[PDB]
Amino acid sequence: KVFGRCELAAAMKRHGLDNYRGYSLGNWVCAAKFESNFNTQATNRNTDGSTDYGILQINSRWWCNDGRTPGSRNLCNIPCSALLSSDITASVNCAKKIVSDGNGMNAWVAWRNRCKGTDVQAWIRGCRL
């Protein structure tokens, strides 16, 4: 599924990501845009042999199981394929565990380099409220 911007904003708010661990909805929409371009099915392999899955590119090295990442963890206790569903519940339940891990949204490379410090509320502009 390719989410529209306000359609994803709606989804993430409903799952409780707005201000989760102090991060506004704009932060989370911004990260999804540069991580997956709002595509639930996005996948791409990392250099160390792990892979990133879904709308928020959740890593197979620590958070989900894809059966092909040596040494790994599955801390969200989930198949990595469940992070590619059109229903984002599982990606949000897993992102809540990742932002809470200690470094906040810095866990998302792309958020740190392309979103952190910017006008992230621009990403929910005009979205129905």
From Swiss-Prot:
It is found in: Secreted. The keyword Secreted applies. In the egg white and polymorphonuclear leukocytes. It comes from the Eukaryota. It catalyses: Hydrolysis of (1->4)-beta-linkages between N-acetylmuramic acid and N-acetyl-D-glucosamine residues in a peptidoglycan and between N-acetyl-D-glucosamine residues in chitodextrins. GO terms for molecular function: beta-N-acetylglucosaminidase activity; identical protein binding; lysozyme activity. Residues 1-129 form the C-type lysozyme domain. SMART domains: LYZ1. Transmembrane segments: none annotated. Monomer. This is Lysozyme C. It comes from Gallus gallus.
